[PDB]
Amino acid sequence: MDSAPCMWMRGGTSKGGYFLRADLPADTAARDAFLLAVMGSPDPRQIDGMGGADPLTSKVAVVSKSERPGIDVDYLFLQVFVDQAIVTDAQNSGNILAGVGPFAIERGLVAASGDETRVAIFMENTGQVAVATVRTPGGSVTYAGDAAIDGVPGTHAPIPTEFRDTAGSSCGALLPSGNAVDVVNGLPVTLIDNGMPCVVMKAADVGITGYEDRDSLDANAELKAKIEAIRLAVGELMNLGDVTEKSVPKMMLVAPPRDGGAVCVRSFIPHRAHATIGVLGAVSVATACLIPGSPAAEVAVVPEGARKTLSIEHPTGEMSCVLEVDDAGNVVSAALLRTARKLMDGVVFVL
Amino acid sequence: MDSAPCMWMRGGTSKGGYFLRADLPADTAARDAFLLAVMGSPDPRQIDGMGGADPLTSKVAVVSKSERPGIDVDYLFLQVFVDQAIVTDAQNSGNILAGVGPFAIERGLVAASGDETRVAIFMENTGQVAVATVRTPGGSVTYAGDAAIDGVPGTHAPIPTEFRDTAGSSCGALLPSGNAVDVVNGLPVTLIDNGMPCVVMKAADVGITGYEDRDSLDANAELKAKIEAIRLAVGELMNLGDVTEKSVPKMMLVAPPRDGGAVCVRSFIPHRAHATIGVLGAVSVATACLIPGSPAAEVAVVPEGARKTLSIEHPTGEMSCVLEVDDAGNVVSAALLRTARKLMDGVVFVL
Ligand SMILES: [Cl-]
Ligand SMILES: [Cl-]
Ligand SMILES: [Cl-]
Ligand SMILES: [Cl-]
Ligand SMILES: [Cl-]
Ligand SMILES: [Cl-]
């Protein structure tokens, strides 16, 4: 009651606590109080709980067996604020998602089935579907292997992840304005939602090249003020209402690729620069690369073929996105690599 | 083998992983590799393990039943470096120590004995003894209660802690120079070890008042260069050898008390300012307050009586130290309040 079984995992480049739904209070307010206490929030240092004093390590997954047709488990993502008594069920960023498949198997929501085991995951926050393929050699999840992702030392078991029903996850449409491009504060942008609502505009159009490192971007007050005025201006158009204290849309500043990739991106999510790029924001940006004349179309190098592999270059490397594009040109699925690791398993306590 | 039972606790204003000795490899090199992997080191973000990406949350306690006369458990403290593949068994700072008593009781090294339970702890790093009194109402440790310590939100069960055999823990003598005061780079200082080797000098003597906040102190390059030249100059005198890449001695800049206390301290440990003060450094400073004409004697207000309560004021509050002083004037024991909390219990995993 003042404890719950819990597995602490790294999912992608994030970390947090993974629960079975039936182990947390049914009452939302009771649930949030418990998770705040588990993390040690509110406290800039989160010294009296399991948060790592950074929003990326103050995250929670709630997983349960699904009754939806074709779905194996339902997954609710929760952000536990570091220094506010606030838990939000914001848009999925796609990193904590990576631990969901392995966690479900370990907890018996899904039994191991051969040496690899498919987990079909409904993302309750947005209504999207992720199919994760996880290594279960011998009938037990493994986290060891040869996969790498930027921002994570060494190598782990690959978890290839295929996203469906991304389109208009949050905005109700791929293009909530109905336009490929909209002029906003005199600038051409794309308002797009293929898994994450994004505003996609050229880095050069807001006075940077798009190749600056994260620290310089975080210190560029005039850049931040400029794109933030754009974000606040488009919230209604994107069916997002007043975005002032919202986490969306992500601001995606695109420049031509430099390392032979598809596109270069600097992401503000919305107010600080992402060290890499969010998974679902990569899908939105890779999709915008395909819409003609659009800011991202103008900078991107897009390969021919129905199965398009788009290497999205970011501050510290690149994240590769495989778009499967039907003969009508819409994106039918996006596949991206994740990794995760079980770090501690047992019981968490609150006062 | 690639896991161990482990309890994650907050101890004082630090956090880390608590093990039974018999659950870790006997081989030191094997042990260090395992603990590095457990924390997610080396990695500035410690994203692939249980470290909180700060040295204060990248700490380990190793506890076992003691055979020493009068000792209940042996405790070895280990610092797991955040971004280096290095584990050190440095001097005890006294915060992780606070979880040792409760952990021993929970693991059955010591059985609960009534509603409060004494744990006599040998600190293997330095040879000191700490007696911790822990609440065991009903025969089970509790972490709830009305105690507070600066740097930890809310309140917890008190763990009153009494230190003995502090004198010359590391230096072999209370005063390794044999002098109450030594002139170093033209400045009077006290080289003292009553639980933590410290250099004690007046804040004013190095060009600050001693009331500056931590951020200003951390940014004072000329202050840091000045006291660091002092530290490097005294390492041999204190029987510490070449202190260049050492963590000791702590630099303690004392000023007259301002909130009715005994003394005001700003601590460099050795290169960044402490947010409060270390427990054992408080004992060393409180002891130096009693040695006549000495820098700390000149600034301190010392109360009459054989049981002296010295409120050591620090950046974010004060830490109170009860010295029990025998008729010969030496310190016979120092008592200080700690708190701890069990945060997660179960098993930790490495690849
Ligand atoms: Cl459940
Ligand atoms: Cl936060
Ligand atoms: Cl997610
Ligand atoms: Cl043991
Ligand atoms: Cl470190
Ligand atoms: Cl300690």
B18 DSSP β-pair partners: B7, B61
- Helix%, strand%, coil% for chain B, nearest 5: 20, 35, 45
φ, ψ at A32 (rounded to 5°) = -65, -40
What three-state secondary structure class fits A231?
A: helix
Burial label for A24, CB within 10 Å (0-12, 13-18, 19+), is: buried
CB contact under 8 A, B52 and A53: yes
User: Cα separation of A18 and A31, whole Å?
Assistant: 14
Residue type at A189? V
- What is the Cα B321 distance to its own chain's centre? 13
Q: Which chain B residues are within 8 Å of A49, Cβ to Cβ?
A: 10, 343
Let me know: does A69 contact A28? Beta carbons within 8 Å: no
Any idea which residue has 């006369």 for tokens? B69
CA of B122 to the centre of ligand 4 (A): 14
How many distinct helices (H) and strands (E) make up chain B? Answer: 6, 17
User: Cα separation of B117 and B137, whole Å?
Assistant: 9
Of residues B8, B38, B43, the one with CA closest to residue B25: B38
Which residues lie at CB < 5 A from ion ligand 6? Answer: B 77, 92, 94, 96-97
What three-state secondary structure class fits B199?
A: strand
d(CA A304, nearest CA chain B) in Å: 37
User: Cα separation of A301 and A290, whole Å?
Assistant: 10
User: Cα separation of B202 and B265, whole Å?
Assistant: 9
Residue type at A276? T
Of residues A199, A200, A194, A198, the one with CA closest to residue A172: A194
Q: Which of B343, B345, B351 sits opposite A144 (nearest CB)?
A: B351
B319 DSSP β-pair partners: B312
The count of C-alpha atoms lying within 13 angstroms of the C-alpha of B323, restricted to the half-sphere facing its C-beta, is 31
Strands B250-255 and B197-202: parallel
Q: Is the dihedral of CA B153, B155, B157, B162 positive or negative?
A: positive
Interface of B with A (CB under 8 A): 6, 8, 10, 13-15, 40, 42-43, 45-54, 56-57, 143-144, 151-154, 156, 341-349, 351
A125 DSSP β-pair partners: none
d(CA A265, nearest CA chain B) in Å: 22
Strands A182-184 and A187-193: antiparallel
Q: Rounded to 5 degrees, what angle do the CA atoms B313, B314, B320 make? A: 45
Which residues have CB under 8 Å from B282's CB, separation 6+? Answer: B265, B312, B319, B321, B336
Q: Which chain B residues are within 8 Å of A346, Cβ to Cβ?
A: 344-347
Task: Provide the terminal-to-terminal Cα distance of chain B, rounded to the nearest Å.
Answer: 10
Cis peptide before B270 (omega within 30 of 0): yes
What three-state secondary structure class fits B286?
A: helix
Which residues have CB under 8 Å from A285's CB, separation 6+? Answer: A198, A200, A252, A254, A263, A265, A277, A296, A312
CB contact under 8 A, B8 and A344: yes
User: Cα separation of A186 and A226, whole Å?
Assistant: 11
Let me know: does A233 contact A225? Beta carbons within 8 Å: no
CA of A123 to the centre of ligand 2 (A): 22
Element (H, E) at B75: strand B73-80
What three-state secondary structure class fits B298?
A: helix
Q: Is the dihedral of CA B35, B38, B39, B43 positive or negative?
A: positive
Q: Searching chain A, which residue's CA lies closest to the CA of residue B95? A: A47
Domain spans of chain A, in order of start: 1-165+335-351, 166-334
Q: Is the dihedral of CA B134, B140, B145, B148 positive or negative?
A: positive
How many distinct helices (H) and strands (E) make up chain A? Answer: 6, 17
Tell me how crowded residue B132 is: count the other CB atoms within 10 A of its CB. Answer: 25
Q: Which of A53, A153, A156 sits opposite B54 (nearest CB)?
A: A53
Which residues have CB under 8 Å from A72's CB, separation 6+? Answer: A65, A66, A104, A109, A110, A118, A119, A120, A121
User: Cα separation of A42 and A38, whole Å?
Assistant: 11
> 3-state secondary structure string, A50-97?
CCCCCHHHCEEEEEEECCCCCCCEEEEEEEECCCCCCEECCCCCCCCH
User: Cα separation of A143 and A158, whole Å?
Assistant: 8
CB contact under 8 A, A10 and B47: yes
User: Cα separation of A58 and A14, whole Å?
Assistant: 8
User: Cα separation of A240 and A261, whole Å?
Assistant: 32
CB contact under 8 A, B48 and A6: no
What three-state secondary structure class fits B318?
A: strand
Ligand nearest to the CA of A62: 1
Q: Which chain B residues are within 8 Å of A154, Cβ to Cβ?
A: 48, 351
Residue type at A133? T
Q: Which of B52, B347, B351 sits opposite A344 (nearest CB)?
A: B347
CA of B11 to the centre of ligand 6 (A): 9
Tell me how crowded residue B26 is: count the other CB atoms within 10 A of its CB. Answer: 8
CA of A130 to the centre of ligand 3 (A): 10
Tell me how crowded residue B329 is: count the other CB atoms within 10 A of its CB. Answer: 9
Let me know: does B24 contact B37? Beta carbons within 8 Å: no
Let me know: does B162 contact B131? Beta carbons within 8 Å: yes
Longest CA span, chain B: 59
Q: Which of B48, B56, B346 sits opposite A10 (nearest CB)?
A: B48
Tell me how crowded residue A327 is: count the other CB atoms within 10 A of its CB. Answer: 7
- Helix%, strand%, coil% for chain A, nearest 5: 20, 35, 45
Q: Name the CA dihedral angle for A225, A229, A231, A235, rounded to a multiple of 10 degrees.
A: 150
Q: Rounded to 5 degrees, what angle do the CA atoms B212, B214, B217 make? A: 65
Which residues have CB under 8 Å from B123's CB, separation 6+? Answer: B75, B77, B92, B97, B129, B130
What three-state secondary structure class fits B201?
A: strand
CA of B144 to the centre of ligand 1 (A): 29
Which residues have CB under 8 Å from A313's CB, separation 6+? Answer: A257, A258, A259, A261, A262, A263, A264, A265
Let me know: does B221 contact B208? Beta carbons within 8 Å: no
- Give the gyration radius of chain B's Cα atoms: 20
DSSP conformation letters of B22-37: GGS-SSHHHHHHHHHH
Q: Which of B13, B53, B144 sits opposite A54 (nearest CB)?
A: B53
Interface test with B, best of A343, A348, A350 (most B CBs within 10 A): A343
- Give the gyration radius of chain A's Cα atoms: 20
User: Cα separation of B48 and B56, whole Å?
Assistant: 17
Let me know: does B289 contact B298? Beta carbons within 8 Å: no
Interface test with B, best of A47, A96, A350 (most B CBs within 10 A): A47
Q: Searching chain A, which residue's CA lies closest to the CA of residue B2? A: A343
| Fold (CATH) for A1-165+335-351 | Diaminopimelate Epimerase; Chain A, domain 1 (3.10.310)
Ligand nearest to the CA of A76: 3
Residue type at A150? D
DSSP conformation letters of A257-306: -SSSSSEEEEEESSSSB-SS--HHHHHHHHHHTTSTTSHHHHH-----SS
Residue A1 DSSP class:
-
CA of B100 to the centre of ligand 4 (A): 13
- What is the Cα B109 distance to its own chain's centre? 23
Q: Is the dihedral of CA B100, B101, B102, B107 positive or negative?
A: positive
Which residues have CB under 8 Å from B223's CB, separation 6+? Answer: B206, B207, B208, B217
